[PDB]
Symmetry: D3
Subunit: 142 residues, 6 copies
Amino acid sequence: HTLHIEEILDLLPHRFPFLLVDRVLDFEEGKFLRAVKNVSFNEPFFQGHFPGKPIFPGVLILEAMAQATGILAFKSRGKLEPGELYYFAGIDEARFKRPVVPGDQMIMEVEFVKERRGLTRFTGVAKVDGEIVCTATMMCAR
Amino acid sequence: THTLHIEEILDLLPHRFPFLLVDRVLDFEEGKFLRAVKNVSFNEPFFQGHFPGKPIFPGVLILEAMAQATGILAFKSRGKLEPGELYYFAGIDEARFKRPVVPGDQMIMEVEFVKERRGLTRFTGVAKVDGEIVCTATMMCAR
Amino acid sequence: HTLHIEEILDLLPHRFPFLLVDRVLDFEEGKFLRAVKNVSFNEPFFQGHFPGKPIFPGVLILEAMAQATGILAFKSRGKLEPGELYYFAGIDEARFKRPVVPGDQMIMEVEFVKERRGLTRFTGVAKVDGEIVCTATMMCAR
Amino acid sequence: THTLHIEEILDLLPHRFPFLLVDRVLDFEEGKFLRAVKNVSFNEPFFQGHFPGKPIFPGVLILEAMAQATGILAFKSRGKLEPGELYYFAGIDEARFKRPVVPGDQMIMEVEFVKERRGLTRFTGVAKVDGEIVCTATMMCAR
Amino acid sequence: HTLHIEEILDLLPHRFPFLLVDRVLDFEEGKFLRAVKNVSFNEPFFQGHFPGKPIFPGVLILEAMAQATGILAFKSRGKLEPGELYYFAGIDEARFKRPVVPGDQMIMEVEFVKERRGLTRFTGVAKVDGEIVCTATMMCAR
Amino acid sequence: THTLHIEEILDLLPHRFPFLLVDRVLDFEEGKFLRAVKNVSFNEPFFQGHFPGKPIFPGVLILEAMAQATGILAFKSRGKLEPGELYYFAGIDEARFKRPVVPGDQMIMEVEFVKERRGLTRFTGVAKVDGEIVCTATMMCAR
């Protein structure tokens, strides 16, 4: 089940310049979601990060993966009511393996692990050209 | 085999944010062709205005992206621009917009040198998404 | 019949940074429209096009003229319903005659030609200080 | 007769996007006056916020534009700024906002040197649209 | 009575990049209001003002103070109806005493003076670290 | 006692708008700690998107701000970056987001060097608003 940007705008509250999921390529509710973030030079953070040497910030890969958990959570468990937020509570073992750059299509896979102590736990893995560029464990809650 | 990443691109084109619309060069043969990629992301500044609730990559920016790709080919083939000189975009023939390009699309653009004629350099461009043609055009430029 | 920016926002769906018609100076439904685009240094594309040498992109003159056809079409033939778009299908014989720069007031005249094979055909002419800076033939459709 | 286009302006003022608010200089006489243009376009970044659905050029930015025009006059008349030096805006007397300036307006601004007094340079500014006064103010600056 | 940003968005029509009141620290209707503007490098005007030497424009201190008069006026006298504006009619004796810079928290105090000849008159004083950086007298009207 | 204002910061970090998220350095001791300020303003570009009607400083940007503060400490302590070299952000352990940071907050960040181990430099960060902890994390970086 693919979701394009209009479906994504309907599910997440994030807007420009902080909506970092461009497409959902597949998902299974309560299990996994696979999303794309297209990395382009024409994104506003690249001016600053860095002048002459565009590097996609590692913190935004964490953000983009956490957004993809949001989409899975909303498809799986129900949409947010207006004014409610899906909290990003924490991150374990964020590892940045190599630089993500303009022209990269970052494919992100997030998996639901469990609920434990009031949080929902996901693992994320981001790849470019089949190679892992980032992993992390993310905790979120409604 | 002959790829250019963004730093190489920044060194050849004078365009900068928010109007540098070539993100990679996949291959090229001097004086002949260049195949480039434009990654289309929601996170691009024009999407706020085009259109609210329904992001559509403007057709004019596909023409722009292709014209930039001709620039890269021209510079690699014929010599870099000196400081303060521009590669003019003089005109366009037969621009055809076939279907909408959207966030998540990777737009692969192929430009071919045709000829010099009457003080202009003529190129044809074809932009594809997922193998299907989204735009074609004939572009005239000059130093 | 002049239209100012609030009337223009009501007719076109374009918003910042891609609404490139600042005023309508006159029009006659089904025939012609004359619009202004004020070119200012304080526009976001100028940072990029080019550093140290601001040049209004020729593609944006095409865009601004196509927007002015939109306004004529909506005034002449009826407003778009929400979610509907006015397609830009093609361009013939776009000619860029000289550079448009900050401080220029670009006056654009678009004329309806005909409907043919499912498209509406317009010609556009953009002038600065009475001199032609661009012409083009534009095809659009609902 | 004495016009300065944007490149000449960039060379005299240190202001850059999104706070360079003089688009052309129509005429000037050193030590006396300068007449400049600010083209007011919807496509300017502050219009998104001022205000949603009702674009109104902020009155504070007319003061800013006029103060920039004094800068140009001062530099042409008295000498360019050296790198790292600033032309301070020290104060303002009797700023009066007469009617709203909007997208599509070309705001013609005329600034006149009055005198130096008490370590400041005093100027009067008048901004017009379609021949009518939209703002006046007396501006004090110093090197 | 403190107002945070959501309360501020409800009262003023200003939006990004021209909403220059970040918090209200106290107020008394018809009398005074004390507001904060946090000055950060990450604000869009700093790119332009100036490259290599960030200086908060003195005109934006005037703006931010005039916004704080707006908030006082709306809390004191009633909210604007949609489409109505609170006019900034004029300024007397704007004095800029020293440069405001990134990292500064500008505390602004505005006081109602009187209504006279169809305008409402306020005085404003902006401080950083207890020292006055700007004063002005502002005239506004519905 | 050892404060660095924005110009000193621009000279040490390569980050520029819209991703320079240290506005001042309040104090530091080389090889030991650095205490910095991030002023959180509505007028920052990410607030438009995060979220419409409910501005919330992204937790990922607190991690970024703290990692930038480690950079400053590292450069002051160990030597500036040469042109074209980067200070890599290699990973993060135990990032905890305790309560939302909002416009008007001044976020005071304290980073401490822990050790070098296994080719990385390890730091702990703590960010506070009004004396209360809003985020903690352990950050690994390397030249």
